Design a binder for this molecule. Structure first.
Ligand SMILES: O=C(O)CNC(=O)C(=O)O
Ligand SMILES: [Mg+2]
Ligand code: NI
Ligand SMILES: [Zn+2]
Length: 331
């Protein structure tokens, strides 16, 4: 069995290997990359996402989100307070202000220490989940707006044509902006490209151990667990690496830098934080290997998770017994 310790793997495809996206995902899996839940892909030196980032300041962040924490430094939830719209140039200036900028630090490990010590005492503002793309239309390789759609994959594997669309999302971050512990909708893959700016640190639990994380989370967030049998679908709970280690939960960590891709694999729980002003693009995708994960994915039916239009068909076809309850939670 390849990668039996479930380490995060880093790949350096050549320009020739970068042509065929599906084939390269399958290659990475042949080497055991999925066992980690997360892989890094460093593009060939010949590749670029677009020519420059000099002309992005007028993009609008219609609903910036202030991430307010409650709890203790290593075990907390966050809620999202909506703020007034602002442009990317306005947001960048805000991120660089004395109130929000990255503190002085020695290296990524020192900054990680500072994040976990101090995150809860601040409320950073995240420009998350903005439909759009920064890939040039002429970029033919690993262009996150030109991937095969999940609806087409389901149709190819299962024969059933379904409604829905699959487009990318932009994320504008600042110091301490945080993504809570989660797997993707319907335990899909994700791919994330860090277009510009400061790094993003990731934590991940191997898919084969995801239920260990869920059991810890039920213990640590006991009111939330009573409220909902899949409350990590709410995307609000954080648990630090120190707490994970104290409770024997298997996990790994890695820092993504500008110009790098990360892939999350089906049922790979992940969480993390941004080092400073940055912009990422991400989208969900599927492969044949996903189908069995989609059929077994947990679902939130309490009302909190509320998701896209396109998840309806995935539940309806892959999980018909759960469909009626889940759709009630949507309405
Ligand atoms: O970058 C973020 O805030 C969160 N991204 C992801 O969870 C992802 O790409 O799957
Ligand atoms: Mg612009
Ligand atoms: Ni994710
Ligand atoms: Zn719920």
């Amino acid at each position: 069995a390849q990668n039996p310790n479930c380490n995060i793997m880093i790949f350096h495809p050549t320009k020739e290997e970068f042509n065929d996206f599906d084939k390269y995902i399958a290659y990475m899996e042949s080497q055991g990359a999925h066992r980690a839940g997360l892989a890094k892909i460093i593009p060939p030196k010949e590749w670029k996402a677009r020519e420059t980032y000099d002309n992005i300041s007028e993009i609008l962040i219609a609903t910036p989100l202030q991430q307010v924490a409650s709890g203790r430094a290593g075990v907390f939830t966050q809620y999202h307070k909506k703020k007034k719209a602002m442009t990317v140039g306005e947001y960048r200036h805000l991120a660089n202000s004395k109130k929000y900028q990255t503190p002085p630090h020695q290296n990524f490990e020192d900054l990680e220490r500072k994040y976990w010590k101090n995150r809860i005492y601040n409320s950073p503002i995240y420009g998350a989940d903005i439909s759009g793309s920064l890939f040039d239309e002429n970029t033919k390789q690993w262009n996150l707006g030109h991937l095969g759609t999940i609806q087409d994959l389901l149709e190819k594997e299962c024969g059933v044509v379904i409604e829905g669309v699959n487009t990318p999302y932009l994320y504008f971050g600042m110091w301490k902006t945080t993504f809570a512990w989660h797997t993707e909708d319907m335990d899909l893959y994700s791919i994330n490209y860090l277009h510009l700016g400061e790094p993003k640190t990731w934590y991940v639990v191997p898919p084969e151990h995801g239920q260990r994380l869920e059991r810890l989370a039920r213990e640590l967030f006991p009111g939330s667990s009573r409220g909902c049998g899949a409350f990590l679908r709410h995307k609000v709970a954080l648990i630090s690496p120190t707490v994970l280690k104290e409770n024997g939960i298997p996990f790994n960590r890695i820092t993504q830098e500008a110009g790098e891709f990360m892939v999350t694999f089906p049922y790979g729980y992940h969480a993390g934080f941004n080092h400073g002003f940055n912009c990422a693009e991400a989208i969900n995708f599927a492969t044949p290997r996903w189908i069995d994960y989609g059929k077994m994915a947990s679902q939130c039916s309490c009302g909190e998770a509320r998701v896209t239009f396109s998840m309806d068909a995935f539940v309806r076809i892959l999980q018909p017994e759960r469909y009626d309850l889940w759709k009630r939670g949507q309405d």
